[PDB]
Structure 1
Amino acid sequence: SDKQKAINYLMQFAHKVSGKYRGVAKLEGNTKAKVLQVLATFAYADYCRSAATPGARCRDCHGTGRAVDIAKTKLWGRVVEKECGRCKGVGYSRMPASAAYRAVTMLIPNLTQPTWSRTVKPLYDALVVQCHKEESIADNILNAVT
């Protein structure tokens, strides 16, 4: 249930942003849906695996995924945040995405790993970041891991 809700949220997000990623936006209907499902599920699971790896918490942001945005902070006179530059918003060291890539090759058989890294994997990375941003997912996973 909680897992189903999380994956549904990630798939809706992926549907909203899929047009931005050339490897995904050009796909056929059924293949696109299957790919978004794979990416959402692997993003959820791989975020959990990052969070469960001892010592994986980002050393720059200490797991928040955020840093102070200097320019915006001085412009507004209030703290304005940006993605942590080291973990790019995940808060943890990243798991290799090779299994996710292989799962996608089942649906896009001519997808090479470099084309994946440049045209599809960025959507998966965005979904992992979204796991960290969405409080429901991030908190459920934190409580489960600890």
Structure 2
Amino acid sequence: SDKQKAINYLMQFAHKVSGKYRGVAKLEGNTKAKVLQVLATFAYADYCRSAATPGARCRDCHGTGRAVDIAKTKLWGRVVEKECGRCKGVGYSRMPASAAYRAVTMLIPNLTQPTWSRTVKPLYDALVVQCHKEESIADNI
């Protein structure tokens, strides 16, 4: 329910801003609503990802996102740590937008990746941003 609450909140935002994105503004009511549902559900799923997400935990740092910087340790006289190189300091892998793209092709079969990049992905990215911007949208819920 908290998940459904968050998704509906995102969906209201998405409907509000949908007019600004050529790939969705043109879509018919029901198809448009389903495309927005896909985009919001995937954006929220990505926002909620962590090292506890099955399969996501970085293999090299085991989720800490940290690793000793041996060159700096040797030249600075103390143990210095850097961001883990494999996960770029996150500790876990993200869900690429390509997953939402493939999900959306089930509703827009002729959607190509370049046209997705130009005309639909910006809405997806905006929904991810909105997840980060809204405190009420919880990453642990």
Structure 1 length as normaliser, TM-score?
Answer: 0.65
Between structures 1 and 2, the one with greater helix share = 1
| Cα distance change of structure 1 residues 31 and 137 upon mapping to structure 2, 3 Å threshold | same
Separation of aligned partners in 2, 1:68 and 1:92: 18
Unaligned runs of 5+ in 1: 142-146
Q: How many residues align?
A: 141
How far off its partner does 1:138 sit? 3.4
Q: Secondary structure at the match of 2:140?
A: helix
Instruction: Identify if the C-alpha distance between structure 1 residues 105 and 97 changes in structure 2 by more than 3 Å, giving closer, same or farther.
Output: same
Cα distance in 1 for residues equivalent to 2:19 and 2:79: 32
Q: Is residue 88–residue 129 contact of structure 1 (8 Å, CA) maintained in 2?
A: no
Q: CA deviation at 1:140?
A: 3.8
In structure 2, what is the equivalent of residue 85 of structure 1? 85
Aligned equivalent of 2:2: 2
Cα contact 2:40–2:124 (8 A) shared by 1: yes
Structure 1 position 103, deviation (Å): 0.7
Task: Point out the structure with max Rg over C-alpha.
Answer: 2
**Deviating more after overlay: 50-59 vs 38-47:** 50-59
Superposed CA RMSD: 7.3
* Contact 2:46/2:95, CA 8 A, preserved across alignment: yes
Alpha-carbon distance change, 139 to 104 in structure 1, aligned in 2, over 3 angstroms: closer
1: CA distance, partners of 2:17 / 2:79: 28
Higher mean displacement: 8-17 or 94-103: 94-103
Assess, with a 3 A threshold, how the Cα gap between structure 1 residues 136 and 12 changes in structure 2: closer, same or farther: same
- When structure 1 is superposed on structure 2, of 101-110 and 83-92 the one drifting more is 83-92
SS class of match (1:67):
strand
